[PDB]
């Protein structure tokens, strides 16, 4: 049931802007801002070039924290700028592979990852979070085998 959110295409000019009463894309409530950090944490997990780099330890033993740090540095754009575009976030991912991973990502595979972070804001702008919870539930199907095996017993 259901279907993938993307396969290669998404947009080419995606971006977001704050209201005239604000100085950053940050939310008015810290309870609602939580939906946004969760949402980006899910999109960075779907990038292929970063996933291979932590499995091959191209960043050393610290690459396991550099993995979760890549969403943390992109989230900071929304906390300090009143407008952000997919081109801003993409450079924040491309440089995060070259600053210590010694890996270039000229395949543009970071483009569709940047456009997804932009739409997390659009959903959180009207209290929606259905895709942020969906990716969080679909993320667990391999953590029960790529980190700690478990015999399932689900039956609805």
């Amino acid at each position: 049931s259901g279907s993938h959110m993307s396969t290669q295409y998404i947009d080419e000019t995606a971006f977001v802007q704050a209201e005239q009463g604000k100085t950053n894309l940050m939310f008015s409530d810290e309870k609602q801002q939580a939906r946004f950090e969760l949402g980006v944490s899910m999109v960075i997990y779907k990038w292929d070039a970063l996933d291979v780099a932590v499995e091959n330890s191209w960043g050393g033993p610290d690459s396991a924290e550099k993995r979760d740090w890549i969403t943390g540095i992109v989230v900071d754009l929304f906390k300090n700028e009143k407008v952000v575009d997919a081109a801003l976030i993409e450079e924040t991912l491309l440089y995060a592979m070259i600053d210590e991973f010694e890996t270039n990502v000229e395949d543009d595979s970071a483009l569709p990852i940047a456009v997804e972070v932009i739409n997390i804001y659009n959903d959180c702008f009207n209290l929606n979070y259905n895709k942020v919870e969906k990716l969080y539930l679909e993320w667990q199907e391999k953590q029960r085998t790529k980190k700690s095996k478990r015999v399932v017993h689900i039956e609805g």
Partner: peptide, 26 residues
């Protein structure tokens, strides 16, 4: 040539875990 960009290097205080943001968002 061009701007130095906002490109950081490495940190572990701003990082986001798939659960550290879910235990507050869910």
């Amino acid at each position: 040539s061009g701007s130095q960009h906002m490109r950081p290097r490495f940190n572990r205080e701003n990082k986001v875990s798939p659960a550290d943001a879910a235990k507050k968002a869910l």
